């Protein structure tokens, strides 16, 4: 029997769900048909309304302490929680309810992990990451906006293969994907080491793939697999395509100053 996943959505842009289906190894099709049972997910599920909500009750009962709760997005605490409404009630109530009997909780993306864009100043909805509301359950943070597809499916695959949470760092991120800074293995590192930098967009240095540090690249302070695993089956990553890393897997990256201001 395949492990049930209940995939909830709070305040979000749905980038994590979209990234998930880009996975090539394994294919999202094979994950859904052969690895998990994706029993609730607003993006893809046939049932709506009362029929959708009934699924939660059924799976929680039959698979108590054996389903994975995946959360994309986050709960707002302002507006009496009704800046995110599900079934006429605050999303935070759904989150707490489904969390109670979960075997494990995955915080997908920077929204669920840290807050992401809606939590940037002045955070009008008081959007709050999952671990600050659910404080009694094991939570794995998979940050990034969105995370790499293979990172998402890689986390699921590990959990299903071993029935264990992968080794986490102090911030709750899986070390198998988040142990390295982008800057460690970035292919532009030899230019950085030789002081070869882009100074203006589309200058001669940019056309030669020089380092993007002076254009604001946050690779040196950002932990992710972007330089090595890369994006969309290793086709590129932000730096290869010519834009500095904006630090999108790091807590509070929206409020660390302009993306184009260099690290000091």
């Amino acid at each position: 029997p395949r492990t049930p996943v209940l995939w909830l959505h709070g305040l979000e842009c749905t980038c994590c769900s979209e990234s998930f289906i880009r996975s090539a190894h394994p294919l999202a099709k094979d994950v859904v048909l052969s690895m998990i049972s994706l029993d609730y997910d607003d993006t893809l599920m046939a049932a709506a309304g009362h029929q959708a909500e009934a699924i939660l009750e059924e799976i929680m009962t039959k698979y108590k302490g054996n389903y994975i709760l995946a959360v994309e997005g986050n709960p707002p605490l302002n507006q009496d929680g009704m800046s995110c409404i599900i079934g006429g009630r605050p999303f935070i109530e759904q989150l707490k309810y489904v969390a109670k009997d979960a075997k494990a909780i995955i915080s997908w993306g920077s929204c669920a992990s840290w807050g992401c864009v809606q939590a940037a100043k002045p955070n009008p909805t008081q959007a709050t990451p999952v671990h600050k509301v659910i404080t009694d359950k094991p939570i794995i943070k998979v940050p990034g906006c969105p995370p790499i597809a293979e990172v998402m499916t890689g986390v699921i695959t590990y959990m299903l293969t071993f029935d264990r949470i992968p080794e986490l760092d102090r911030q709750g991120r899986p070390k198998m994907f988040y142990s390295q800074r982008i800057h460690d293995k970035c292919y532009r590192r030899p230019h950085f080491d030789a002081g070869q930098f882009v100074e203006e967009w589309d200058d001669e240095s940019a056309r030669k793939g020089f380092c993007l540090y002076k254009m604001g690249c946050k690779g040196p302070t950002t932990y992710n697999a972007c330089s090595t695993t890369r994006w969309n089956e290793g086709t590129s990553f932000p730096i290869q395509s010519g834009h500095g890393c904006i630090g999108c897997s790091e807590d509070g990256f929206w409020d660390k100053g302009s993306f184009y201001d260099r690290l000091t």
Binding site: T14, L38, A46, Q51
Partner: protein
């Protein structure tokens, strides 16, 4: 109580039905309807059930950073907000971008159109038309025969192939863990397809799921990643070096451009061999069943800003020409000007926001976003447990955009109606959409019925297009047209590069010390779901105001000051339901707008 608006007789005295959550959309929506004694919808209520406040968050920030913030309005229509934003800032600051940057943006935009459209149809919409359990009853041989009739050119057509797919679906269902198919509405009389049509569609659902990840690699080349590719005020960051020194390390070299063309060619094949034929066939069969409901405002009022100029910066050459049509008069298209304070305006009379004066609509340069979550006195339930929402008061996180006070439908269907009207008036740039529409009408009325042994019909485009079927058709045709267009864009890009113009960014006004101290700008995009605009005011190097009016804001809007209904609400009106507590028809029509609720509310 009952009232008439826009030729619709709203009546809230019947049986109330609640659908919350509305699933197979992006984001969060609640829908309520009232049905009469005969199960016909006579009232419909669209409630956007999320808000994040991007417009508030943007205040005080650097305009050069804005695109990345607003890109995160939505990961489904990923990039279209970034495009609107850079366009708005470039408009405010009088920045002219290089030709290659324009073409790369166009290729990225058209890639999104195809990806978004095809994924919407198969993964979000198809289950409103296709009964997956019925697919299990199909004959593999007859499915092969159907595939060959529907699309001869598609190579995946053998009986053994369909048998293999059917067998895997069987094993999946027989496991008792139905996953995304759990608690579905299978077997409802609202489903009309024969088993073979269902199996063919489910097979393509799986095919599209595997292929969609390939198309977006075009975004990955030019923008680093998908979802959320990177953009740039003044051009694109993907500097070009075809084969010169450092070319291997450059964002764009010749090998990477060849790769993009390969992906484009695959898209062309998918649209013409899989997506368009499936929609024509499914549309034909539902037409034959008489399911022509869901026209709503499409029968009268449609709008788009117009996009994709043949000649850059020459709007008369738009390949999806826009404007506004009113009262179903396809003989006159009014120009739409996003700068005109009397044209695009947003009301909040029935929205959870506040203005100084809510009897008026604000143009987005003057827009205000202050939350005001409060429920009407006729609400059933409490502030945190809504049982029945009170649509006489404030009932949605979505504002109410109107054009010169008129409620409009936006989207691919609106663009195709506008394109048809332009082409009829003698606009040559709109000839392809016109050709697609006439071909489609012939296929749906005559060619596919004859092939399937069904009676022929004589619906005019005027009768066929304003319907949920028509809205679904236009999206598929638009996908095909966008693939064709970016195929041409690719050639134009490579030609320009080879001619010696390799520029990708204008940096003359990158430094804020070069900016006017005050400025306003607007950027518009023909986004996958319709007319998108971003309106910005800049003061002393910072964002003073940033207002977004997004396609699903138009379509999903609640009632305005005058009580006029928006596109979602109008489309649900006058629709019979087989079973009032199974929302099949509600989902089918709502999904035909491809609702993006995160977009609608931002």
């Amino acid at each position: 109580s009952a009232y008439a608006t826009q030729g619709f007789n709203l009546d809230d005295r019947g049986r109330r039905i609640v659908v919350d959550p509305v699933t197979r959309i992006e984001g969060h929506m609640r829908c309520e309807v009232n049905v009469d004694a005969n199960n016909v919808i006579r009232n419909a209520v669209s409630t956007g059930t999320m808000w994040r406040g991007l417009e508030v968050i943007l205040k005080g920030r650097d305009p050069r950073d804005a695109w990345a913030f607003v890109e995160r309005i939505c990961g489904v229509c990923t990039g279209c907000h970034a495009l609107a934003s850079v366009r708005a800032v470039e408009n405010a600051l009088d920045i002219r971008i290089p030709k290659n940057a324009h073409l790369i943006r166009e290729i990225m935009a058209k890639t999104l159109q195809v990806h978004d459209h095809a994924v919407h149809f198969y993964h979000l919409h198809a289950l409103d038309w296709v009964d997956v359990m019925s697919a299990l009853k199909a004959d593999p041989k007859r499915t092969s025969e159907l595939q060959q009739l529907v699309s001869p050119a598609h190579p995946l057509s053998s009986a053994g192939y369909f048998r293999d797919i059917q067998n895997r679906l069987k094993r999946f269902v027989e496991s008792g863990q139905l996953g995304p198919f759990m608690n579905g509405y299978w077997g409802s009389k609202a489903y009309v397809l024969p088993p073979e049509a269902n199996l063919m569609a489910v097979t393509h659902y799986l095919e599209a799921l595997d292929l969609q990840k390939e198309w977006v690699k075009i975004h990955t080349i030019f923008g680093g990643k998908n979802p959320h590719p990177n953009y740039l005020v003044g051009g694109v960051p993907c500097a070009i070096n075809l084969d010169g020194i450092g070319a291997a390390s450059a964002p764009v070299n010749m090998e990477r451009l060849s790769f993009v063309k390969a992906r484009i060619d695959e898209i062309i094949e998918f649209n013409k061999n899989v997506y368009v034929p499936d929609v024509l066939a499914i549309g034909t069969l539902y037409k034959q069943a008489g399911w022509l409901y869901g026209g709503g405002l499409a029968a009268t009022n449609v709008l788009d800003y117009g996009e994709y100029p043949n000649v850059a910066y020459n709007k008369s050459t738009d390949q999806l020409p826009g404007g506004a049509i009113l009262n179903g008069n396809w003989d006159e298209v009014f120009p739409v000007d996003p700068r005109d304070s009397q044209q695009v305006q947003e009301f909040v009379s029935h929205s959870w926001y506040k203005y100084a004066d809510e009897s008026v609509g604000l143009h987005p340069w003057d827009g205000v976003t202050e939350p005001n979550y409060v429920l009407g006195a006729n609400t059933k339930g409490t502030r945190t447990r809504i049982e029945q929402i009170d649509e006489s008061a404030k009932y949605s996180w979505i504002k109410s955009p109107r054009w010169r006070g008129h409620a409009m439908e936006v989207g691919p269907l609106s663009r195709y109606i506008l394109a048809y009207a332009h082409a009829r008036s003698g606009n040559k740039y709109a000839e392809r959409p016109k050709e697609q529409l006439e071909y489609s009408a012939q296929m749906i009325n005559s060619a596919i019925p004859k092939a399937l042994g069904l009676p022929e019909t004589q619906y005019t485009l005027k009768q066929l297009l304003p319907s949920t079927i028509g809205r679904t058709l236009a999206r598929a045709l638009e996908s095909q047209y966008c693939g064709e267009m970016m195929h041409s864009d690719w050639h134009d890009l490579v030609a320009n590069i080879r001619a010696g113009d390799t520029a990708t960014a204008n940096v003359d006004k990158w430094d804020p010390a070069t900016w006017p101290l005050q400025a306003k700008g607007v950027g518009t995009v023909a986004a996958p779901r319709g007319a998108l605009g971003h309106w910005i005011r800049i003061k002393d190097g910072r964002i003073e105001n940033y207002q977004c009016v997004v396609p699903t804001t138009w379509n999903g809007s609640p009632r305005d000051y005058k009580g006029q209904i928006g596109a979602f609400e109008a489309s649900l009106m006058n629709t019979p339901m087989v079973n009032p507590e199974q929302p099949v028809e509600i989902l089918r029509t709502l999904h035909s707008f491809d609702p993006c609720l995160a977009c609608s509310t931002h």
